[PDB]
Amino acid sequence: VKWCLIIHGGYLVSIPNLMSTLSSLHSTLKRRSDLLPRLLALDARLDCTINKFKTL
Amino acid sequence: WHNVILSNISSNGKLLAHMCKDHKSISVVSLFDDSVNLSFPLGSILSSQTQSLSYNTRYVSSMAIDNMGQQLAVGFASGVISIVSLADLQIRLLKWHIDSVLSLSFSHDGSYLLSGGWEKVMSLWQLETNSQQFLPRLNGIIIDCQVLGPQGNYYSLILQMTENNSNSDYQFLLLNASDLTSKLS
Amino acid sequence: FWGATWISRIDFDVDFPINGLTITDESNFMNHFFFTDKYKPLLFVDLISSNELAIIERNQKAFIQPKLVF
Amino acid sequence: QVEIANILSSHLEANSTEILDDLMSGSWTEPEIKKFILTKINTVDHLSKIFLTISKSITQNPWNEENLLPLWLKWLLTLKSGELNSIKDKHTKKNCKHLKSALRSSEEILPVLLGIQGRLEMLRRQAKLRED
Amino acid sequence: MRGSEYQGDQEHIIHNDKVRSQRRMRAFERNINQFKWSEALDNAFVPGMAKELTLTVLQELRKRGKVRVALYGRDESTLEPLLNWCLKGIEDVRSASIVADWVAVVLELYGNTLESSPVLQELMIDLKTKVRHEIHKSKEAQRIEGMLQLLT
Amino acid sequence: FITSQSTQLFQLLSLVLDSIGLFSLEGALLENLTLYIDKQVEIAERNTELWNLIDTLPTYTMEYLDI
Amino acid sequence: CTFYTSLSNQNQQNIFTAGRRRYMHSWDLSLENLTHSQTAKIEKFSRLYGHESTQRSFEN
Amino acid sequence: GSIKFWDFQFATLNQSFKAHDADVLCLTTDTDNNYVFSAGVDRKIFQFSQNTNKSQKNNRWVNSSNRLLHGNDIRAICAYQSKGADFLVSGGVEKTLVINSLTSFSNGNYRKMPTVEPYSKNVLVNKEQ
RNA sequence: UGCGAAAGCAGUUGAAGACAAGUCUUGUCGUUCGUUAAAAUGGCCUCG
Incomplete structure (x- = not known):
């Protein structure tokens, strides 16, 4: 997906509609980003406990 | 009666059981006759472990009196029910309820x-x-x-x-x- | 002096300050201070040397009766 | 390193205002921060003073490029969380709220940055392809 | 038994009070109905268990408020089946949020046992590498999302 | 000005870059903006880690007895 | 199956019926239920209050 | 897991209690046959009381109380009463005695004897070597 | 507890009286004034 946008970015701009035809893509990308706030929260708690015994 | 905390009447309507602060004491009285008239402190009914534990165990939330007056059920905030034989104050524990x-x-x-x-x-x-x-x-x-x-x-x-x-x-x-x-x- | 669950020491040159589940014993049987209960249960206690004390301590499937936790 | 630990140790006892300058010293290393926290911070009061100083600094400017003060905060929380929450000082709880407020914003800021960063990369890659 | 097929076509009154038995419950549903919180979690991680159905029992226990309760009487031997699935379920989007909750609790309850258990450590090490990998994917997805907004 | 609450400014910057379009932007300036944001992303990731942290027998032993 | 009339209340009329099943049916015939009523008042007895092990069928 | 009371003259069941969740390994009773105590695999001791005058007249026992005092099976149980003693002594796979009161089993206190009381020593220490 | 959006922004806990335990020190409240202000082994039917 990343390379399709970069290479054919000029072509994609000159398209009458994008959201309706790329609704599945846009929705699919939203779900992954929603995990980011909570994945950091889990990572911080992991990183804390990983550090604790590794030094011990 | 003074300082009534909790009260109940039998199904027949002929017996009254009540609890007072006179910690507490339970008394059962016949209403139309003088046949039943008894009183005893709640401490005797309560178990020793109950005296050791928190106040939920010593807090009665329900009370029932049999028609004959031979049995009295006391329900506690712990979820434990105790049937008391009034003739000799013998105790019997029924324990299913997890809450009051x-x-x-x-x-x-x-x-x-x-x-x-x-x-x-x-x-x-x-x-x-x-x-x-x-x-x-x-x-x-x-x-x-x-x-x-x-x-x-x-x-x-x-x-x-x-x-x-x-x-x-x-x-x-x-x-x-x-x-x-x-x-x- | 030591028992199954306690250890003690008494000095015999110093006098002390004056200030249910067993038989009541109404009938006859026939016809300077140290106390600790930290070490228990004890198999044996004795000295190895003048300043070394040896305390020897004790280090099956069961029917499951769960403990409710909320 | 040893001298800065000793200067820092003395100033913590002396309640000097120069504690902040000592914490920013460029001689501090990531392993040395652990060793100082584990070995020298034996009293709650010393732990409180360092956290109060670090928290105040980061609260004023969370976007400082100097990674050292955050590195102190990270390992102070990682290694001494139990003792830090044990502190009952009302001001310490207030400082924790102020610090959390400043950092809480930055978390909200991050998703916007990644979105901008993505567009620029496409702009950079597109120019490279046009060049080639 | 020559009248078993009458059906009462000639009679004045026909009374039908039989009720069909409910459709067969699974093991995990029976455990939840009987308030077996710890055992219901065990049924989740069993061989040949559908991933979607494994996610329901984990969601049901959370909804019932029984997440710590399901995790008390456990050691390294019986914790690995949960962590093994979490190692794979973190990758999935639907189970990512649920895995974060369960993994957060087990760390808060079994920090001490983890120090003395070497096997539990490596489970967390590979868990930290994968959760770090997921962070990169989610960060990446935001960048394509920013790219896509620019086009439109 | 930027390269020299803040997200409400950055979100305004992100709106601008979309308004500018892909053609109008210039490479030499684009490099400064690219370098600058990468610094910002690193800081935001750092603070997010800090924010979550704030939210978060032997067979033989020798001892000395106290008399 | 059997009719049953209360020994005290002669107006109480009832039919009990059972078979090779774990329940029993009672049909209240009292008042005008036998003839005039459009429907039957049927109750099912199916609870043994802890003694299901000693009882397999209501037939006898 | 059931406790049953039989009439001896007619050899017929009087009462049946489904009390325990597993085998009942031992029974005991007090001097006056006012209490019957059962114990077994499920680690519980159950009390059956016929002390009420109404109960004695009707010859009906009552499942009064039970207590969980043992960590494993209760293989043996015994009772003793005198003017100065009132014991209910139990033990089993836990390898330790448990002492209760017969008359005050429900409310009375209890003592768990230590598993090993080294009255006769099984270890010695040599200062030399 | 108040406002607010879900984010958050401000602030809050006191005086008694009675009793239980230790032996003068502590707890509790089927009791009052004021302030916007865990844990008695104890889990949910039958109708195949």
């Missing part, structure tokens, strides 16, 4: 005890064998229990529906004893 027991009622013959609380489950304790029959998934927590009829044809329950904190929502349920189906809600 809210309603107790004896059968007319005294051989069954209806109990209800926060579980939304009505339990008929068979006192001969200490067994129990259940009616679960009621609409609300059971505030009051009664056996109604010369032969115990019906059970009249009061339900509370504690989900709504903005108000107290009571529902009156009359069940058929034979098949435990709602005769009238």
